[PDB]
Design a protein around this ligand. Structure first.
Ligand code: SF4
Ligand code: SF4
Ligand code: FES
Ligand code: FES
Lengths: 633, 633
């Protein structure tokens, strides 16, 4: 099973699924082989009813689409629609939070409130909204109105792009016409220009894709900002991860999907319902996380992470998962079918994300506590139904220190330099104790043995003194293999990095180091890494494409991860992707995305499926940035 | 060549392309055979990097996508993205016109103006915008602001849906949650819900698709409304169609694409440049139309139509096409390559629609006359380069009476009943002289011998006394085969229909009938057919799903035609599609779209590739509506 996942708890559940005859994502992948080589290379188009069209990567006809679309047009149009789909997911998420904040401060959703007033005021000031002598509710109404205004054209560009990057980077982007006019405006313009008989020039298409990726960045940054206002900015927390966080004698409830508007309420209301659970024979309600909504409640409340991404079905295979509470994105719809076998109650809550065979309980923010109570009573009823049933929870878990928002990182560094917190970090980049920074982001993918690329690349970078930060299911992979436990610093980190993590943790009163990898949150919280990187660029007086900072979507899957990788390149970063994207059928498009975009934005993709080689390429990219700053490497 | 096109001028140019070795759309189709059966049936998904996934229509594995997506989820998600892409094209078009109207009345684009003040005031009143004592420019600013507001969420739904359909139809739609919240909002929500791990219930997905099709209807109706304000509402005109409208001794300039913001200015400025053309040795500038922008200037100015849709390359093959002036949509990018062989100057003008190898001349409304002059001087230079070169213009053309806006149809009928213009039409539906109404819409498609389904179905319906209206390249097909020449009424029309067309034409002073088919304009001007049908439903006090009115996208191609067919079903019409849509891989989705949607909206798709059978099915749908009104049939 180690060919499927490197996680030992997942391996144990794969054995259980096998002997019980429950089909998994790895079995559905095996049944799909061999996969179509036209789609793998990007050489397929279904954008009109004269299709499907394809182009042979090599050989004879077909060489061109029926309307005359070339390989480079077809590959660029498909990539652009992927970017637009990812932007559409993050900005649906962000819009959901904007409408929740508006409702809250208008007295229409009493379950929600302004928790981080300090963040509210800093965002308002960044946006140019006056705060002095204003009521908090009025300030918040204006921030929610500004959030919703960024979805359409208006007399300013998207402010969650132009106010969050340094002016020099905004100027580079503006010079190439890449600043978005409105988030949903760009998504629609992508779908237009990629439709039949429209844009048919690869460079023009890809410039439109870079602009739409910045609409995705705006939706990510907006979602972090609004979730911090409503639910609190994360601070360091300790918890646990992997399937051993499930408890046979508890009501086990996973929150899965993305939006904390739902997850955060499940967590607080589950606390009020402890006695009701105990009357049912349980010890209480054990809320556990899956995917990004799990990261959101891990970061803010220390809720333990059960599993992530490709292995999500395995939590159900234990037999102890009483409920799986869903909103949207990254939920394998197989869960509705596996539930019939495992007894889990799978519950959907959003009108635009239903799964045939799952129970639907409408969740309205205006009725959030009552709707949560209804959902959790379903969970309790399910617990009661499995009294006396054996379960198989692998007794496997790791310790996880997390909660490293950019505010938390700056506060930690301020213990070493109160009025110039970024300087101790920059000092140690200059003296070589920190070689550079790498952000691990994005999904697992069934084509890659689960977590193998994240852990292989992270181990090599940590030994080379790279400061490693992580989000999403990249953070999930690293946490489940011990990379967020400070007890593993001696084993994993080079001496320079160890000295730095130790000096910071000791200054913060822990009698020990920060963990080997800093968890910066969910996938929208890739925006927190942008805030940190932009702050370092501003402090140094250089643009982001001069910093020794890289990114790695080492096991990418979702269209959201394609959008995030593309805005990482657009803001100036060398960005690794560890799975094959559907671009190899066009050498001109590949050369744009891996080489000539450097002359436009300073960033570039690094496509490399072998993780040791990928680590070497990421180190060479870091070191080339060090050399360009005049630093040893 | 008659297996490729039923148009004799196209056949002649196919012979020329063959002996000159110029590859055409029919040759690129032959080189694509056999096409992929997964894509033909809809059983392919590339929505994440674990793909491509496919499902065998029949047999053994694969049976399900890797994430667990079923055939019915995969088929519904692909259809929904098609609908969203079509909506994105029509609402880009409509947004372009809204920004042009705003610029005009703000003094920022003097080449444009309020031409139809009567239309401006009626639209304002429909929208609830006060006009009394207001300046026209202020009224127009408010209508342009209302147009742009319909792209995003606000405190009202999309008004270019809710104010253009009767209240009883809006109520049906609202009860099913199908009224759009904002045009670009719905496009983004489609791209979100169809991304991996989101909506996975076929009925839920398709309900979202119906709602997004009404966002497409809003963009079509908005584009007709704003183009009529700026350029005038069409009235009856006489002109000609087919390749014989090209003139060897003139500068031949085709306008191709969609938006009259560009086409209409080319037409008026070409008039001022007659002397400059003559100094170059030409008789003048001969502007001719291709596709919908050609329909726009045919309807308003009587500009002759050269060709349409699938045969667009053939205008270039004559050797006499000096320039092809493009904005966006439905332009085969092959034209840039064929230009190298034929000498034509292909010119793009919009930033989001470029074609490698074509000349780009930015067109800005603020500089429209100068930008047009630059473009037309390129055309004149090209004319000069082909002095002494033989050309081969087939001497084949038809007479075309067109310009039947809904206002023009009502005015014509008012000659028979001044204060109740719709009554003479309803009288003749009741007495059987008019059996019902059929709208032909949409494209040609290279899989169908060009025009064969339009002409075959139209002939059978006209003999059965159906009033036939047409738009887009359906109107193009019918005009090129003589169906818009009143000299062909005796041959084509049944006695009842002939009596009606004759009584109306004689009352309008023509000493003869209206033509056999009424040209209602471009593809956005399918909205004019909605206005007529809604007016008849209001006059009769019934909803649209009780009227003997059907639609036929007999040779559909573009994602726009999929969106239009879907809103035709959503507003209550039996809607034929004459090509195979990628739905047959899911029987549950096919049964929803061809049968159970009747219980939701009263409309339904009729998929039928054999045009005689399709005509019989359309007549049976008309007659079933007659029976439901208590009428003989
Ligand atoms: S848009 Fe062009 S390449 Fe794509 S399916 Fe249609 S004819 Fe084929
Ligand atoms: S979304 Fe599901 S069906 Fe589609 S490519 Fe990804 S794994 Fe396959
Ligand atoms: S031919 Fe396989 S993805 Fe289209
Ligand atoms: S397998 Fe051919 S369209 Fe994907």
């Amino acid at each position: 099973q180690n060919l499927k996942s490197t996680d030992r708890a997942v391996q144990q559940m794969l054995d259980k699924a096998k002997r019980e005859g429950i089909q998994t994502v790895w079995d559905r992948y095996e049944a799909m082989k061999p996969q179509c080589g036209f789609g793998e290379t990007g050489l397929c188009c279904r954008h009109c009813l004269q299709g499907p069209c394809r182009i042979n990567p090599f050989g004879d006809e077909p060489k061109v689409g029926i309307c005359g679309a070339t390989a480079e047009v077809i590959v660029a149009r498909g990539l652009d629609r992927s970017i637009a789909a990812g932007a559409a997911g993050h900005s649906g998420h962000a819009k959901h939070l904007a409408h929740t904040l508006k409702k809250a401060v208008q007295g229409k959703a009493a379950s929600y409130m302004i928790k981080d007033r300090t963040k509210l005021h800093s965002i308002a000031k960044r946006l140019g909204i006056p705060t002095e002598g204003q009521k908090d509710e009025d300030i918040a109404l204006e921030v929610a109105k500004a959030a919703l205004a960024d979805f359409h054209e208006k007399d300013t560009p998207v402010l969650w792009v132009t106010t969050v990057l340094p002016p020099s980077r905004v100027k580079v982007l503006s010079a190439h016409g890449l600043i978005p006019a409105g988030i949903d405006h760009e998504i629609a313009e992508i779908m237009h220009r990629t439709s039949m008989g429209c844009d048919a020039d690869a460079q023009n298409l890809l410039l439109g894709g870079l602009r739409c990726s910045l609409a995705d960045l705006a939706g990510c940054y907006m979602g972090t900002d609004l979730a911090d206002i409503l639910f609190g900015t994360p601070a360091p927390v300790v918890t646990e991860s992997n399937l051993g966080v499930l408890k046979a004698d508890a009501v086990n409830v996973a929150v899965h999907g993305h939006n904390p508007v739902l997850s955060d309420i499940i967590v607080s209301v589950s606390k009020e319902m402890e006695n009701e659970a105990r009357a049912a024979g349980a010890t209480g309600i054990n809320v556990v996380g899956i995917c990004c909504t799990g990261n959101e409640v891990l970061m803010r409340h220390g809720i333990p992470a059960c599993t992530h991404s490709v292995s999500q079905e395995m939590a159900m295979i234990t037999g102890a998962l009483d409920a799986m509470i869903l909103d949207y994105q990254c939920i394998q719809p197989s869960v509705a079918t596996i539930a019939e076998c495992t007894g889990t109650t799978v519950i959907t809550t959003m009108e635009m994300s239903k799964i045939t065979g799952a129970t639907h309980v409408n969740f309205a923010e205006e009725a959030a506590v009552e709707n949560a109570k209804q959902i959790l009573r379903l969970a309790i009823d399910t617990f009661k139904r499995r009294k006396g049933k054996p379960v198989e929870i692998p007794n496997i878990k790791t310790k996880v220190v997390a909660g490293f928002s950019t505010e938390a990182i700056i506060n930690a560094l301020s213990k070493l330099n109160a009025n110039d917190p970024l300087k101790p970090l920059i000092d140690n980049v200059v003296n070589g104790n920190i070689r550079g920074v790498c952000l691990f982001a994005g999904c697992n993918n069934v084509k890659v043995p689960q977590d193998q690329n994240f852990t292989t690349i992270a181990r090599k970078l940590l030994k080379q003194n790279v400061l490693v930060v992580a989000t999403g299911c990249g953070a999930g992979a690293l946490m489940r293999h011990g990379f967020m436990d400070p007890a593993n610093v001696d084993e994993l980190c080079g001496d320079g990095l160890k000295a730095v993590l130790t000096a910071i943790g000791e200054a913060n009163g822990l009698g020990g180091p920060l963990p080997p990898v800093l968890h910066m949150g969910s996938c929208v919280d890739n925006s927190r890494a942008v805030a940190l990187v932009a702050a370092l660029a501003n402090r140094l007086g250089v643009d982001l494409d001069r910093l020794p900072v890289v990114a790695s979507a080492a096991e990418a899957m979702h269209e959201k991860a394609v959008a995030i990788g593309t805005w990482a390149v657009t803001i100036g970063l060398p960005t690794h992707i560890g799975v094959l994207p559907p671009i190899t059928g066009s050498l001109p498009v590949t050369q744009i995305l891996t080489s000539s975009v450097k002359d436009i934005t300073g960033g570039y993709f690094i496509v490399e499926l072998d993780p040791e080689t990928a680590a070497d390429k990421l180190l060479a990219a870091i070191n080339e940035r060090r050399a360009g700053l005049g630093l040893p490497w």
